[model samples]
Target: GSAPKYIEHFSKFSPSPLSMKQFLDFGNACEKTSFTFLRQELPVRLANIMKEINLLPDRVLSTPSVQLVQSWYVQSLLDIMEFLDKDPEDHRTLSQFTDALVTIRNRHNDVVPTMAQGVLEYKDTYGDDPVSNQNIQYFLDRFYLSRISIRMLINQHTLIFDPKHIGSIDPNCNVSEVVKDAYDMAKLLCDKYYMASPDLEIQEINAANSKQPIHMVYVPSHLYHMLFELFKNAMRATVESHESSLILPPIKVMVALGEEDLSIKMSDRGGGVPLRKIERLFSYMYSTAPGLPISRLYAKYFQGDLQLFSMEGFGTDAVIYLKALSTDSVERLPVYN
Candidate 1:
């Protein structure tokens, strides 16, 4: 099966948007319904993702990291194809299909890190060529974004059909609980490294009413991952800037539940980033933290936005905007040309 043929075939269609409610429905779906969905959906998603990678220029595609990733994609596609060829109506065959998906999902655990290494390798070989560098960056943004969507589809299915696997998505994911969890984890890292960690203050505001706690239908792990990275950055900066001070200012997290959007503003007394270098923060080449770029992509994958504002010497504010309604939280996927 040539990649171009599959690419052309899948290119005729767009990836279906996945909302929180749809995710919940899938989780609650019967085994036969879930199996049927995966049978038809997985191959299309894999093909589209493979198409995006195959679209990379030869120079970038030839990097060792990229080649390794390509091999994984090929093997995964073959696995899916083999599974599709089976009679899923039979109980034994159904079990085999589930097992195959679990293996595929585990195999892809390193995709993000491996791809990051590929970008570095590409830069090493063609550091002087600005055009190629930009091209690879553009490819990566789309590639990784698509990978998230593909993985989410596979994960949601496997977790639902297979009883042993723990689920990651929460139908009623609490905003403040995840924030506090992230804060606690970040504080541990800060205290261990710097011997001091600042306090965390959370404020919840609801536009419609005074709500004690806010809830959203989303993935808690994704939220935790993003918030943890941001909190770690803020805490590291705050502790370092006030190294000699007896006490440090608290990091403030304001969770405002608006009618259409859920906004989270995390403010820190860490000296602000310079205006000129702020854009590079999201670049894969920049390494303030390895996970920063991935976290931003997570925000974008759900049709949301992550923005940062820094006040030169005073502090920095990181604002994350997510669509509040499940229906509005559509998957922001990459389109094939």
Candidate 2:
């Protein structure tokens, strides 16, 4: 019983001076910026420190007031500033001061809201596309994030505390299932956003030839979403080129699962990325088309072997390859150099 008691007690007794600083220095940070991200990393730990001086995160989170959190958290910063002012001359711990400045900025109480009337109307107007279900889902995820930009500042901070906890995998080995879902989601993006019509026919993905089913096991669905965007841009590139008799072809997904590695390849028939911009192929927001730029994240996650055969104005081809993460498992990731 004492051993369990000691663990809890010792845990509570760990050293963190923020609480004491707040208690001793409330007045100095009256108009200070905030440091919400740092506070968010150790939710319980920070909460306990607040409790010692009678401030609670729950109080902030639950309040209906506009930016209740920014108020409470910022007030906490005020306390730290007061403490620092008492000894501004003893400035050896410049790092601590630097950190406090960020904490101060994070405490601003600003709220920006949006009504659901317009959103609901849009949803009603565009009922989910039956064939391209994943695109709709992907759009919803993005909209959800954007809906609470103010809230996201705090929520995004949670990522800093435990990023590994954030990915698709569970603690156990049941991780690869997510890859399959990701692949499906990618296909969804291709359906919703891309306009890939061509002289060449669309290919049916047999299991032997496709990592589509396997793609559902590794990678995030957002990647496929970006790839689809690339495809859309590529298609636009084709239509605008207006080179009569140009035989553009449909983009296809190709997968090869060998004894040692699984590779997912996405191929396109638009003019390959220009030799000049090819190096920036994986760069974010880089587009040969001035009007249509592939997202930065898309460039990172996708963009591979770009083969172009411009024989008096024939179309180009882009083939992207993602190597499996492990030799043992079929979960493919990029073969990072």
Candidate 3:
């Protein structure tokens, strides 16, 4: 039934031009326009949230601030959309998206501190009450999720237009390869940013399919984002926990690809957090790791999540569970009584 419907839809996809490549360009233009429209809406959504909470200096959320931000995003969206619509064959659309994305990321940098201050104030004012606290926290969570969604939309679209990622990202993604690539990039970034680096070791286990390539139908961008964040934290922990003169245990990555799912455990010998403070890892306000917000979103988007295990004075292990297939049943977020 699904196949017939898909075939019917395919049959109805009339190309804007008779040429096959022209058809692809037309489709790409339409997608770019749609994605840009969503990105443009995000700042307006953020503006509404700002109005609801008195978190920043009056100037930060002034009418002018919202107007400037919204206009910038809308104009950027229109710029890319117009280019896509007119020159659909040109591959510069991705470049346009990336250029605008960087601007958008930078545009909000000044306001991020104000947002952080709001989070702190929200907590201080409502720390004692669970309902108020949950409300504020959920607000932050939604904001971060929206932020990541925009970035991921851009990334997914970029991959579609990328010659390298073309036909190589979905069904052809390899677990080990993505992990190794992520490890390398994470190590490099950690070294550059933190000024210290730790070694990382990858172990592929789970017995079955251990020898065969653990290939899965998945988005490598999502996997890379998750692995990069996990490794960045682990590497930072290892370096900061041990002295430069002392020998440090390398961050360990254990990949267990079972019939049901792919589980990755990142083990670091960094001093672990106390049991009482373990929940802070998921606290959007408290984490020192900037990737916490978006990384969590990626984990959830993949029908998986990140779990942390730590022993005070011992090491910490971050476990990530991603369903191997898109059709796999998703695990729901836990509910507390």
Which candidate achieves the best TM-score against the true structure? 1
Model 2, residue 261: C-alpha shift (Å): 4.3
Query: In terms of lDDT, which candidate is strongest?
Result: 1
List where candidate 2 sits over 4 angstroms from the true fold: 1-196, 199-216, 246-248, 259-261, 280-313, 325-337
Please write out the lDDT profile of model 2 over residues 95-212, one tens digit for every residue. 4644543454354323212112322333444443433234323332232322222232233222222223223221222223333344354445444554434322233233454533
Candidate 1, residue 45: how far the Cα is off, in Å: 2.0
Tens digit per residue, CA lDDT, model 3, 222-269: 788788888887887777888654787888888888877788888888
164-215: candidate 1 lDDT, tens digit per residue: 2236677677889999999999999888888889999999998887855797
The C-alpha stretches of model 1 lying farther than 4 A from their native spots are: 1-8, 128-133, 163-166, 288-290
lDDT for 256 (candidate 2): 53
| Full ranking by TM-score | 1, 3, 2
Off by over 4 Å in 3: 1-114, 117-133, 158-164, 167-169, 189-196, 288-290, 329-337
Question: Worst 10-residue stretch by lDDT in candidate 3?
Answer: 14-23
lDDT of 1 at 106: 88
Query: Per-prediction TM-score, please?
Result: 0.92, 0.34, 0.62
